[PDB]
Design a protein around this ligand. Sequence first.
Ligand SMILES: O=C(NCCc1c[nH]c2ccccc12)c1ccc(CN2CCC[C@H](C(=O)NCCCNc3c4c(nc5ccccc35)CCCC4)C2)cc1
Ligand SMILES: *[C@@H]1O[C@H](CO[C@@H]2O[C@@H](C)[C@@H](O)[C@@H](O)[C@@H]2O)[C@@H](O[C@@H]2O[C@H](CO)[C@@H](O)[C@H](O)[C@H]2NC(C)=O)[C@H](O)[C@H]1NC(C)=O
Ligand SMILES: *[C@@H]1O[C@H](CO[C@@H]2O[C@@H](C)[C@@H](O)[C@@H](O)[C@@H]2O)[C@@H](O[C@@H]2O[C@H](CO)[C@@H](O)[C@H](O)[C@H]2NC(C)=O)[C@H](O)[C@H]1NC(C)=O
Ligand SMILES: *[C@@H]1O[C@H](CO[C@@H]2O[C@@H](C)[C@@H](O)[C@@H](O)[C@@H]2O)[C@@H](O)[C@H](O)[C@H]1NC(C)=O
Ligand SMILES: CC(=O)N[C@H]1[C@H]([C@H](O)[C@H](O)CO)O[C@@](O)(C(=O)O)C[C@@H]1O
Ligand SMILES: *[C@@H]1O[C@H](CO)[C@@H](O)[C@H](O)[C@H]1NC(C)=O
Ligand SMILES: *[C@@H]1O[C@H](CO)[C@@H](O)[C@H](O)[C@H]1NC(C)=O
Ligand SMILES: *[C@@H]1O[C@H](CO)[C@@H](O)[C@H](O)[C@H]1NC(C)=O
Ligand SMILES: [Cl-]
Ligand SMILES: [Cl-]
Ligand SMILES: [Cl-]
Ligand SMILES: [Cl-]
Ligand SMILES: [Cl-]
Ligand SMILES: [Cl-]
Ligand SMILES: [Cl-]
Length: 527
Amino acid sequence: DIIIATKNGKVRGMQLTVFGGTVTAFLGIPYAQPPLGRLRFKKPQSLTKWSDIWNATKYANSCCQNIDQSFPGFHGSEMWNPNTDLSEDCLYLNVWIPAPKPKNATVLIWIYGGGFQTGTSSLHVYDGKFLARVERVIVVSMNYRVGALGFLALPGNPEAPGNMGLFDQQLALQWVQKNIAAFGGNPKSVTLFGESAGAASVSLHLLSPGSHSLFTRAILQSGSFNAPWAVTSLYEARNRTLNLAKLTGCSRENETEIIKCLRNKDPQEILLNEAFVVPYGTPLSVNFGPTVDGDFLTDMPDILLELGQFKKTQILVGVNKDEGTAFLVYGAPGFSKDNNSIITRKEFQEGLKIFFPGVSEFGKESILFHYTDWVDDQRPENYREALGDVVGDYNFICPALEFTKKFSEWGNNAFFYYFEHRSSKLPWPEWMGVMHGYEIEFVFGLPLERRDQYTKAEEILSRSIVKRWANFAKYGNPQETQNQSTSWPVFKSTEQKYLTLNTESTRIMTKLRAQQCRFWTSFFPKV
Ligand SMILES: O=C(NCCc1c[nH]c2ccccc12)c1ccc(CN2CCC[C@H](C(=O)NCCCNc3c4c(nc5ccccc35)CCCC4)C2)cc1
Ligand SMILES: *[C@@H]1O[C@H](CO[C@@H]2O[C@@H](C)[C@@H](O)[C@@H](O)[C@@H]2O)[C@@H](O[C@@H]2O[C@H](CO)[C@@H](O)[C@H](O)[C@H]2NC(C)=O)[C@H](O)[C@H]1NC(C)=O
Ligand SMILES: *[C@@H]1O[C@H](CO[C@@H]2O[C@@H](C)[C@@H](O)[C@@H](O)[C@@H]2O)[C@@H](O[C@@H]2O[C@H](CO)[C@@H](O)[C@H](O)[C@H]2NC(C)=O)[C@H](O)[C@H]1NC(C)=O
Ligand SMILES: *[C@@H]1O[C@H](CO[C@@H]2O[C@@H](C)[C@@H](O)[C@@H](O)[C@@H]2O)[C@@H](O)[C@H](O)[C@H]1NC(C)=O
Ligand SMILES: CC(=O)N[C@H]1[C@H]([C@H](O)[C@H](O)CO)O[C@@](O)(C(=O)O)C[C@@H]1O
Ligand SMILES: *[C@@H]1O[C@H](CO)[C@@H](O)[C@H](O)[C@H]1NC(C)=O
Ligand SMILES: *[C@@H]1O[C@H](CO)[C@@H](O)[C@H](O)[C@H]1NC(C)=O
Ligand SMILES: *[C@@H]1O[C@H](CO)[C@@H](O)[C@H](O)[C@H]1NC(C)=O
Ligand SMILES: [Cl-]
Ligand SMILES: [Cl-]
Ligand SMILES: [Cl-]
Ligand SMILES: [Cl-]
Ligand SMILES: [Cl-]
Ligand SMILES: [Cl-]
Ligand SMILES: [Cl-]
């Protein structure tokens, strides 16, 4: 029996067998008052003490969210859907600790992605038991509110101030500061890591003064706040809040009366209408996302980044080779996971209208001009590959590179990776390459399990990535010092060195996507 005394009461965990040893898991510890009734849309409220033993032996409810129904029965998409009951009562977190209990272990806190509209910490690819067993770190993950229930915004109005899901994340960081020492963790050695909207979340904790004292270092996988999908303008948020009110019959003049009307709606009615507040949105529209609320976020974050207003610490940032391809089969014409998706010029132009709905004709022509200067005008995959690169460079790679440059210009060590390994088990077709989200299982050490049908080269790759991530968290330096490994240089704004991650040979390269990102970062914001 493993019972830990936390500040709010005792929790009981369970023993897990991992690789011939033991990991202790505490799954589903509450860290806030359930945000129900009058607490819906508010900031998370502090948890009141209990006196029995809370049984932390199963993953808790996932927060309410809409579900991907595009590929029923298909593992490639269903692996991202929630795998526990949906409930507004979802503010829980998980703790994996090594056995025997560590003395002063470094702590890794995972923040999942999902566009701020979906996600849950209980997904199989976020299972922290391998990291705790192999590297003897403590792993923490939390559920935070998503969609309108997490990010509905009436700026300055505490009934729905915005950024509630980010404050959920923050209160869980605070829980770790106050309680992790009882589990054998070091609250002075805490590394946030996350992917996609989780990585954008990590980048916003770097900018939020209220999070400054709650962590040490940060890892950003395939995301950052300056990505075009990651922050909702106050103009959009207000129009989207009022649109949700109209769709649900909750339009009033007293804005507080709107929120009170929205508080009497079943979660399902909110979710169903959430999806329609943005009329001409992109696929996978970030309907309700982070805003400049004057609380969590004190100014437009691009200004904060440019003028050096962020936590001074080390960062690890990276992207995958084919970030853009997954999104093509959620709306681009002519695309399908079940054929090779050779598209025409006309289909490409149609795809740009899908992914750039608010943009002028000239802006879309400029994308076409920069991505259709072919080396060989006859390759039939030209337009298919160009559209994936357009979407991946615009939405992920160029914002990640720009974040890393601007962050490093203020003197801190930054490390950039380019993940280019395609999982041997990938259920998606080959044309989609190295997809958004498919480095996560390597970071969490799933290929270390020899039973799981990964190759030997993938076991070794995951083993090296796990060690580099653990060494970054413990020591601020993502090296693998023992196996004659390529040394990972610091990313500087001048030479812009990065490390490629693959099964063949890791290489030091410079100036990833230099020509493309000059287009997206310097020219396209003007259109
Ligand atoms: O994550 C989002 N947005 C990123 C930024 C971005 C936004 N719009 C873009 C347009 C272009 C480029 C970027 C963007 C996102 C996620 C869900 C929603 C809301 N849902 C609700 C259910 C119905 C519909 C849907 O079908 N959702 C599919 C679930 C996603 N599941 C996958 C995840 C990963 N990898 C996958 C790989 C293959 C297939 C599915 C993958 C990794 C991170 C975790 C989720 C919309 C909105 C935005
Ligand atoms: C656990 O270790 C900390 C020190 O952690 C190290 O330094 C952190 C800043 C982190 O970034 C990592 O590099 C390391 O894990 C101990 O903190 C010390 O606490 C004493 C209290 O008397 C204080 O006087 C020292 O200044 C602290 N040292 C540092 C470096 O901040 C802490 O005491 C350790 N706790 C246990 C139970 O072992
Ligand atoms: C690849 O498939 C897409 C999608 O078509 C669907 O999926 C296929 C696997 C097959 O089951 C079809 O019957 C399905 O309709 C094809 O795109 C469609 O092309 C038709 C032209 O006949 C057009 O009217 C549809 O609107 C297209 N659908 C979409 C979503 O764009 C595409 O032509 C196929 N490409 C190749 C190279 O085979
Ligand atoms: C919490 O759990 C208590 C103990 O659970 C039992 O004992 C341990 C050793 C495990 O083997 C577990 O599988 C067993 O079921 C219960 O006695 C207690 O009732 C539980 N409390 C609640 C509220 O569920
Ligand atoms: C409310 C909810 O979503 N899930 C609850 C489930 C289900 O009500 C039942 O399993 C029936 O489906 O019951 C519990 O007692 C359990 O066994 O974990 C508590 C848990 O919170
Ligand atoms: C929000 O903006 C769209 C497009 O500009 C418009 O059609 C809609 O009526 C607006 N909603 C409100 C509540 O004004
Ligand atoms: C709206 O209602 C709340 C509570 O019912 C009240 O405090 C407030 O004064 C009303 N008017 C405005 C403009 O907020
Ligand atoms: C280093 O190589 C040895 C085999 O020579 C292997 O057992 C070990 O897991 C490797 N370590 C890392 C961190 O890759
Ligand atoms: Cl209530
Ligand atoms: Cl309700
Ligand atoms: Cl052509
Ligand atoms: Cl390797
Ligand atoms: Cl160079
Ligand atoms: Cl350059
Ligand atoms: Cl240019």
